[PDB]
Swiss-Prot record, chain A:
Ca(2+) 1 binds at residues 19, 22, 24. PANTHER family: PROTEIN S100-A1-RELATED, S100 CALCIUM-BINDING PROTEIN. This is Protein S100-B. PROSITE patterns: EF_HAND_1 (PS00018), EF_HAND_2 (PS50222), S100_CABP (PS00303). GO terms for molecular function: calcium ion binding; calcium-dependent protein binding; kinase inhibitor activity; protein homodimerization activity; RAGE receptor binding; S100 protein binding; tau protein binding; zinc ion binding. Small zinc- and- and calcium-binding protein that is highly expressed in astrocytes and constitutes one of the most abundant soluble proteins in brain. Weakly binds calcium but binds zinc very tightly-distinct binding sites with different affinities exist for both ions on each monomer. Physiological concentrations of potassium ion antagonize the binding of both divalent cations, especially affecting high-affinity calcium-binding sites. Acts as a neurotrophic factor that promotes astrocytosis and axonal proliferation. It comes from Bos taurus (Bovine). Keywords: Acetylation, Calcium, Cell adhesion, Cytoplasm, Metal-binding, Nucleus, Repeat, Secreted, Zinc.
Length: 89, 92
């Protein structure tokens, strides 16, 4: 794979490393989303140490209202992060 | 860096490998977009050889109509590709 192709696959893989833990294997519940952020975005985003933040992040990401973050919603999160990083530089 | 953080950085890296080649250093013109697809998406998309094909890709991606693909528009392209890829496997 090229660098870009590897990045695409990594996005899918990381989503599933977390979505597949509990409940529906194709969505991130609050606890899965928290762990993804704390373990995999520790250099980019402040660590989540409060359940209120979990609740508010999920509210922001959960566009279809099912209480969880699906792949589409995760990709919108990735786009937000990547845009923020781009602006940073 | 986690794998996710490395992937994010790779997106920014690749965009800039191509956007700074010609003209506006912050956007992909058609030639730069063709080169990006042909060299970085050679396993996921058919090689571009015809003008009409790169014209159509740019038309599809160029949400703001300025004739080039900026970073936001590139990120939307990446999301399209990633979503399509993920649908080839169990995804529900
Ligand atoms: C991206 C980010 S994202 C910050 C939340 O919007 C970042 O914090 C960072 C820090 C240091 C080097 C690189 C980066 C990013 O690419
Ligand atoms: C990703 C892609 S790119 C999007 C194609 O519409 C792909 O073509 C593909 C084909 C076969 C297996 C896996 C994948 C992808 O992960
Ligand atoms: Ca789950
Ligand atoms: Ca949802
Ligand atoms: Ca350019
Ligand atoms: Ca544009």
């Amino acid at each position: 794979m090229s660098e870009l192709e590897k990045a695409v696959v990594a996005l899918i893989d990381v989503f599933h490393q977390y979505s597949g833990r509990e409940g529906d294997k194709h969505k991130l519940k609050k606890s899965e989303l928290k762990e993804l952020i704390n373990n995999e975005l520790s250099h980019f985003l402040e660590e989540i140490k409060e359940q209120e933040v979990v609740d508010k992040v999920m509210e922001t990401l959960d566009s279809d209202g099912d209480g969880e973050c699906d792949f589409q919603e995760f990709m919108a999160f990735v786009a937000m992060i990547t845009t923020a990083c781009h602006e940073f530089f």
